[PDB]
């Protein structure tokens, strides 16, 4: 909620990834810029929720 | 008398002293330096301000410094050689030559 | 007592800006500001437009 | 006799009014506690000072 | 007040605490999560203009949270800071740990410690909406059991009502508080030794804190908000208390 | 050095009164050492002896 | 195009920061105790803790009265004495001629408590503990410290004279 | 210079590059700044005379008190200094050793005496007006600001004629009689 | 003798060499109590030897839970047995400092030649490990601790409070 | 807190002057004696429920 | 200027004057004191508090 603040860039992650374990182990880089994409990969690795 | 920084082009202190200046020297660093006027030896800072008017050293034609004792020496047209401590202000010795 | 002891050679550096009436007593403007003595033509042109 | 009052004629009435006058002085000297909230209101009503510091100092 | 009253927010001398000046003055702090009151207290909204933002301010209830009673009492320097970290003890609900989270900002975090699972479920639910709060359901008397989760807090605040308040604060401050860090303890005289009076309890507990190398700086009775209480604010010296 | 008393007190003391209980950095350890060995050979002029 | 009235630049002796003596460059009101009336201090209830100085100790030896059961006669209620670490340090700094009064001071029935001062003054410590709490009762037998504690309200003081003690500010004298 | 720490400050209690014992508390630059004298040796040139007054002060007092040679002498010197203006008291004679001061002798200089007659805005702006050639003592203007004005001569210091320093003064009063081209 | 000490980071365990012992007679003094504040003085006392990070957040939760019950985990047993020299279980056991006094019998049951020390001396050193933290590990840390403390923080809090997202 | 500019001035100084002289708005209030100069950083908000 | 030999006393001490002290030869942190009351106390000087 605090790294990708765009409304539809958030939503299309949810259509693609469902679990934070799924987001770390599989592809997301199509719909994100790479410096943001690598940093949500750290977010999918260690997180809060 | 100009407290000249030399390798770079800066000038720390420029002074126009209307008495006949004879000899000036840095004493402990580049900051504090002491000039010798017509009748009295003055001591200056990096900004060109006066610090003390030395009541002794009543003639200073040749003024030198030796660094490991903080010792300001003066001997001019007067026969006397006066040793002065720039660390404490005590005139250490007054030799009548 | 201050009247008899004027010493008519004094200068304070506000003798330029402060004016005096022809009768003898000093004058002070109603606005009191040092900027609203009058109005320039660019101000008058804009203020009449408003 | 100089004209005294009905208050001095009884000690029990005098001790009551002397105590209630001393109680209102005590509320003026220090902020004593009174009740809590049986109603709705949240904070205070007499203003909040900034540089007040009504705390005793623990000097060594 | 009502839904049409207006106030002027002026910053209090303590940083992070703000003052709402109206017809009556109020003690207010800027909220983390807007729109929802953590325990039903009222809240103030301002708008600042770039497109505008609507940041919401939340009032601090003095009679339910003992820290707010001490602020309007007036302290020399409450060590809870706009940037530092704070170790709460005894935060059952968010009666005050929401506002302590509000005064330390997003840069600092707040470590809420409580025992019972019934208010710890509420402490879980709030700490996932204010990201600076993390809760400790682990027992506060034994800091060894939760030493994984806390690293070098800067402030410790006591609100637990066990009679061994001096032992439970020293055992936390010896291992989690930084040097020269602030120690705030809300001393309750009924919960420590009810057989003896209030000032005897206050003299005893500030002496036990001096024995455990916690120098006291100030005490405040907070009388008009709560009977028979005190807060003792002091600095953890640990090296030459004299 | 632990010292008793007739006053009922058991005081504990230092061996050398100028040293400290710290662990020092290698710069401070050398310079404190250098103050000691230079003091050892230069004991014999009387104004080192006057202060010591 | 020079300026006018040129003067030699010198040392601005009341202004510069290179001197030692020009290196210099929240209202406080301590509240009254909430357990204190005008003059009562209603928190004075049994048991009691007395603060002891040397002039209390040395006169009690002079007047043949031991502390714990001697405190029983005047104050008449249950009370235990406590002596600060500062006081016992300076009481035993009197030396050899009061060591019997030293021995009566160190006793398992006389409680002791620690201290935090960069000093050993008995009068300054006893007042500061009194100011910060208004909880204790003080035993003193010199006029300098007695007037210092008589000027703070609500603090019971006791002294010794004749054969036994005498309390001053306690309402429950009997 | 480094705001030296305690373990070396006790070793260096007596060091100061800025303040020395021969510098007599910096009373030279203190009375120099207050009264705005230009060069550096002018304070000490007064101090030799102010020391010489005190030298004749003490040497008058080893004499017997009821000496007829004494009875004439210091009253002659007191009237000399009163007409000088350096001391402004005829009653005491102990003032001729105590109240005789360089600050007593430098307030009788010209630019201070402007400020006592309120003819200048400050004590420094008098030096500016004296050096620009505006100030006369009787017939002639003097340009040296280091002029001691006699107590009698204090009455006659005006502005010079036909000058712009006088025209502004008379224009505010609406008094300019330009037949005398003032 | 406090020859080895142990700190347990939120991501992994660590075993530290103690090169110098602060003198424990004057352990309440002004000088030695502030000597852990300076990183230039604490690093003469301590030096890293081993640091085995936790393989995942799920492994980090149960390992932190096993410490909370006062039991030695598998990863703690693995990192200690392969760092402590095999000393005697009868004479002059190797001294290892643990922040928990309760973990003493659990370690010595598994490792009979190692003794657990939790004094004021041991607690002051382990507090100094927290005080410097990331500086002492020479960058070996698997991830930032400032998220690792928070990540394990809600893991242990939610599991002990026993609630579900359903 | 954001700085007060010299705009929206008619709606702010009326509130500031009323808060500064709030001791006479109601004869039955009697606030603490204080000064309350207009602060150099402040803001305006309304209480909502 | 750094000669500060007193560094602290142990506990509250005994009550008549210790006439026998024995340091622990195998451990750095312990000693035993006994005074004229026939009371013996075991001291940890790390905390400067008696065990028992």
Swiss-Prot record, chain E:
Changing residue 135 to S: In nop1.3; thermosensitive allele showing a decrease in histone-glutamine N-methyltransferase activity upon shift to restrictive temperature. Its main location: nucleus. Its EC number is 2.1.1.-. It is an enzyme of class 2 (transferase). Residues 197-229 are annotated as: Helical. GO terms for biological process: box C/D sno(s)RNA 3'-end processing; maturation of SSU-rRNA; regulation of transcription by RNA polymerase I; rRNA 2'-O-methylation; rRNA methylation; rRNA processing; snoRNA guided rRNA 2'-O-methylation. One of its GO terms (cellular component) is box C/D methylation guide snoRNP complex. Belongs to the methyltransferase superfamily. Fibrillarin family. Component of box C/D small nucleolar ribonucleoprotein (snoRNP) particles that contain SNU13, NOP1, SIK1/NOP56 and NOP58, plus a guide RNA. Interacts with snoRNA U3. Interacts with MPP10, NOP58, SIK1 and SOF1. Component of the ribosomal small subunit (SSU) processome composed of at least 40 protein subunits and snoRNA U3. This is rRNA 2'-O-methyltransferase fibrillarin. It comes from Saccharomyces cerevisiae (strain ATCC 204508 / S288c) (Baker's yeast). The gene is NOP1. The chain holds residues 80 to 326 of 327 of the full protein.
UniProtKB/Swiss-Prot annotation, chain G:
Keywords: Nucleus, Ribosome biogenesis, rRNA processing. Residues 48-147 form the PINc domain. It is found in: Nucleus, Nucleolus. GO terms for cellular component: nucleolus; nucleoplasm; small-subunit processome. GO terms for biological process: endonucleolytic cleavage in 5'-ETS of tricistronic rRNA transcript (SSU-rRNA, 5.8S rRNA, LSU-rRNA); endonucleolytic cleavage in ITS1 to separate SSU-rRNA from 5.8S rRNA and LSU-rRNA from tricistronic rRNA transcript (SSU-rRNA, 5.8S rRNA, LSU-rRNA); endonucleolytic cleavage to generate mature 5'-end of SSU-rRNA from (SSU-rRNA, 5.8S rRNA, LSU-rRNA); maturation of SSU-rRNA. Coiled coil: none annotated. It holds the Pfam family Fcf1. SUPFAM superfamilies: PIN domain-like. Its main location: nucleus. Disulfide bonds: none annotated. GO terms for molecular function: RNA endonuclease activity. Essential protein involved in pre-rRNA processing and 40S ribosomal subunit assembly. Required for the early cleavage steps of 35S rRNA at the A(0), A(1), and A(2) sites. Interacts with FAF1. Belongs to the UTP23/FCF1 family. FCF1 subfamily. This is rRNA-processing protein FCF1. It comes from Saccharomyces cerevisiae (strain ATCC 204508 / S288c) (Baker's yeast).
Curated annotation (Swiss-Prot), chain H:
Keywords: Nucleus, Ribonucleoprotein, Ribosome biogenesis, RNA-binding, rRNA processing, rRNA-binding. InterPro entries: Ribosomal_uS4 (IPR022801), Ribosomal_uS4_N (IPR001912), S4_RNA-bd (IPR002942), S4_RNA-bd_sf (IPR036986). It is found in: Nucleus, Nucleolus. Pfam families: Ribosomal_S4, S4. SMART domains: Ribosomal_S4, S4. GO terms for biological process: maturation of SSU-rRNA; ribosomal small subunit biogenesis; rRNA processing. Signal peptide: none annotated. It comes from the Eukaryota. SUPFAM superfamilies: Alpha-L RNA-binding motif. Residues 108-174 form the S4 RNA-binding domain. GO terms for cellular component: 90S preribosome; Mpp10 complex; nucleolus; nucleoplasm; small-subunit processome. One of its GO terms (molecular function) is snoRNA binding. PANTHER family: 30S 40S RIBOSOMAL PROTEIN (PTHR11831), U3 SMALL NUCLEOLAR RIBONUCLEOPROTEIN PROTEIN IMP3 (PTHR11831:SF1). Component of a heterotrimeric complex containing IMP3, IMP4 and MPP10. Interacts with MPP10. Component of the ribosomal small subunit (SSU) processome composed of at least 40 protein subunits and snoRNA U3. Belongs to the universal ribosomal protein uS4 family. Required for the early cleavages at sites A0, A1 and A2 during 18S ribosomal pre-RNA processing. This is U3 small nucleolar ribonucleoprotein protein IMP3. The lineage of its organism: Eukaryota, Fungi, Dikarya, Ascomycota, Saccharomycotina. The gene is IMP3.
Swiss-Prot record, chain K:
Present with 6620 molecules/cell in log phase SD medium. This is Protein SOF1. It comes from the Eukaryota. WD repeats lie at residues 13-52. Interacts with snoRNA U3. Interacts with NOP1 and MPP10. Component of the ribosomal small subunit (SSU) processome composed of at least 40 protein subunits and snoRNA U3. Required for ribosomal RNA processing. Belongs to the WD repeat DCAF13/WDSOF1 family. It is found in: Nucleus, Nucleolus. It comes from Saccharomyces cerevisiae (strain ATCC 204508 / S288c). The chain holds residues 53 to 104 of 489 of the full protein.
